[PDB]
Amino acid sequence: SGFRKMAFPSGKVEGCMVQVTCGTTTLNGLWLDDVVYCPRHVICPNYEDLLIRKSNHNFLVQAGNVQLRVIGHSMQNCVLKLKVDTANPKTPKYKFVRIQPGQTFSVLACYNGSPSGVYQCAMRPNFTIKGSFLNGSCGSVGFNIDYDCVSFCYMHHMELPTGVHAGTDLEGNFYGPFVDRQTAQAAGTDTTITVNVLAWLYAAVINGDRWFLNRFTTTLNDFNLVAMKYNYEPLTQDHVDILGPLSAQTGIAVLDMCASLKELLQNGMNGRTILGSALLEDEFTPFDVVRQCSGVTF
Amino acid sequence: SGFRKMAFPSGKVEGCMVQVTCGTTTLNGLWLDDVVYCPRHVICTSEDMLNPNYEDLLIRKSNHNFLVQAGNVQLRVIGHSMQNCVLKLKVDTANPKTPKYKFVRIQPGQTFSVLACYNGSPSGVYQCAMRPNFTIKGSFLNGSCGSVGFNIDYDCVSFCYMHHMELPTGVHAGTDLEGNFYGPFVDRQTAQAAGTDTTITVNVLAWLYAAVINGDRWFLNRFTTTLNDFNLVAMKYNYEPLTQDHVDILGPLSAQTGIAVLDMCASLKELLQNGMNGRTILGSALLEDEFTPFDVVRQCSG
Numbered sequence A: 001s002g003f004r005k006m007a008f009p010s011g012k013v014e015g016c017m018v019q020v021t022c023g024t025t026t027l028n029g030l031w032l033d034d035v036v037y038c039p040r041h042v043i044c045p046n047y048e049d050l051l052i053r054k055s056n057h058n059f060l061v062q063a064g065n066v067q068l069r070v071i072g073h074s075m076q077n078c079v080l081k082l083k084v085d086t087a088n089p090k091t092p093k094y095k096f097v098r099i100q101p102g103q104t105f106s107v108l109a110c111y112n113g114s115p116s117g118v119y120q121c122a123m124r125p126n127f128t129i130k131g132s133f134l135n136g137s138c139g140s141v142g143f144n145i146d147y148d149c150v151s152f153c154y155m156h157h158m159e160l161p162t163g164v165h166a167g168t169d170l171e172g173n174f175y176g177p178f179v180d181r182q183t184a185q186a187a188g189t190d191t192t193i194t195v196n197v198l199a200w201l202y203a204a205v206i207n208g209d210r211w212f213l214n215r216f217t218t219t220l221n222d223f224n225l226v227a228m229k230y231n232y233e234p235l236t237q238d239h240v241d242i243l244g245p246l247s248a249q250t251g252i253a254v255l256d257m258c259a260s261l262k263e264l265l266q267n268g269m270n271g272r273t274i275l276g277s278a279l280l281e282d283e284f285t286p287f288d289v290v291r292q293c294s295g296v297t298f
Numbered sequence B: 001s002g003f004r005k006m007a008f009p010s011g012k013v014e015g016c017m018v019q020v021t022c023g024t025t026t027l028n029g030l031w032l033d034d035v036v037y038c039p040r041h042v043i044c045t046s047e048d049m050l051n052p053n054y055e056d057l058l059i060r061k062s063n064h065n066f067l068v069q070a071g072n073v074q075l076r077v078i079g080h081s082m083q084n085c086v087l088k089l090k091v092d093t094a095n096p097k098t099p100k101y102k103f104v105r106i107q108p109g110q111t112f113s114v115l116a117c118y119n120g121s122p123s124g125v126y127q128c129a130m131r132p133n134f135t136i137k138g139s140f141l142n143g144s145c146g147s148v149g150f151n152i153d154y155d156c157v158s159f160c161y162m163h164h165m166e167l168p169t170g171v172h173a174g175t176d177l178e179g180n181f182y183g184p185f186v187d188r189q190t191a192q193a194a195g196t197d198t199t200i201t202v203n204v205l206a207w208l209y210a211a212v213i214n215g216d217r218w219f220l221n222r223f224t225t226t227l228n229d230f231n232l233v234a235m236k237y238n239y240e241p242l243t244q245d246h247v248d249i250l251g252p253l254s255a256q257t258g259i260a261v262l263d264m265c266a267s268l269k270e271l272l273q274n275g276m277n278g279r280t281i282l283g284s285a286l287l288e289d290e291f292t293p294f295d296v297v298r299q300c301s302g
């Protein structure tokens, strides 16, 4: 029993964190084999013009108390790839993956190439992440661990004026309509990840919380007309299919749980909590619920 | 900016997790140097659990009865001893991944990271607090026994908790790494229940200071309170009494925000009376008590 916001064990990623310095700027890098990946703003804009004026020895890379000597450098979108002399012996089995809004991942927050904390979070529908980052956190990464393979999905780049965060996949493509420079940019209107709230309601039922259940059902169309009014993401048939296992485990049909969510949106919690929360939680995917309420290891 | 419940990086602890088997029972062990630490109830059957005589059960065991697995490598047990509710298995190989460590016993209100494991394999990491009733509100399934709670300060891992059992309400009970339980609990399948839980007041105040640091001041008021008047109101909400030591501990945050501790107490009294009125503090609709004054300083400054 118990339900917590849980991150993947960070060990395989901790062995990849390095410190990258160029001029006055110091941020974090990800050392995998003989390449170090970091945000291209470390050179700061005409990035090609700024990079062409740099030599290998301008980039100081530190792996613990050992200096790595840069032997080459190239740019891929908004990521700088620093070719180093030494291959990382702690390089795990990995993939670079681009995630979709609603998908969750673990963040290993780092300062000066040193991991300080690990937390779990979701890619919001507005492509921002509600992280916890201070100055120096740039280059911190987001990941998932499947079996023994680490899937790198996020690299931190900047903080937006509202306190939320923006970054790229490991190929340097931003999530969202953001650019890596000092300019007027703001997060779009955010929405609640509906499939995630439903998964969290199933996790509450599994942990013995049934007060919100009712005898009612709804059509998918009637539910989406309600959900659109409460700034909730539209629920698709794929979402309904993905929730099938949890529906079978609890005996509550997906459209039956949608009618429970409809009543919570129109009437509130009324002094009650669900899994210790007074708000409807949307940062646990259907897979996170299955993994936590079944005990999958890495 | 941003405020999250943050766990310590689990890497230094992952390199210590092993699987321990005694007959039919399989749980987790913590391998540090040439000793593996695990709950002593690994020697018990389910029928032993009502009234087990651990000394009598352990005297009937030999070294080769304990099977220890570190990844795909079997460790050879060369000795065994019991210290309170922990079994200490002496092994023939020292763990090369043993970090700089300490065994620390924590007080209620203190926080720590939990690396939940099944069959000596880490599955997840989360943050939690030692509740005033000595239980932890964890997320544990069967087979998670032996999972550990820790803090990492600088490069030293401080082991403060080892998981032993789940109480009937779904909360968890365990020991420090010397085998002494937190709370009035025993490693017996006897009728035992958690005491009435209370809110960790010093932690809620620290979290209100974290909200002020992140630019949220809607809950502040023009009032102050005496410590005694605050505790008379707090008791009625099932909040832990706030001591002068707590007030001293909150001094740095008070100096950083410019809000006196007894003024932050007046705002908490008002929040307990009024509720949030559709508002949130640091993305939460409830008053958060699992961030200590030290966690707030660490996360908001460094």
Ligand SMILES: Cn1ncc2cncc(NC(=O)Cc3cccc(Cl)c3)c21
Residues within 6 Å of the ligand: A041, A133, A134, A135, A136, A137, A138, A157, A158, A159, A179, A180, A181, A182, B001
């Ligand atoms: C300075 N600072 N405070 C908090 C914080 C959290 N995460 C990141 C940063 N850093 C930045 O935003 C730096 C930056 C500035 C303009 C453009 C880019 Cl691409 C990057 C933070």
Ligand SMILES: Cn1ncc2cncc(NC(=O)Cc3cccc(Cl)c3)c21
Residues within 6 Å of the ligand: A001, B041, B049, B140, B141, B142, B143, B144, B145, B164, B165, B166, B167, B172, B186, B187, B188, B189
């Ligand atoms: C069986 N089970 N379900 C969930 C869970 C979470 N954590 C731990 C356990 N396991 C136990 O409680 C086992 C036990 C039984 C009686 C006495 C002791 Cl000391 C230990 C869990």
Ligand SMILES: [Cl-]
Residues within 6 Å of the ligand: B105, B106, B107, B110
């Ligand atoms: Cl303590």
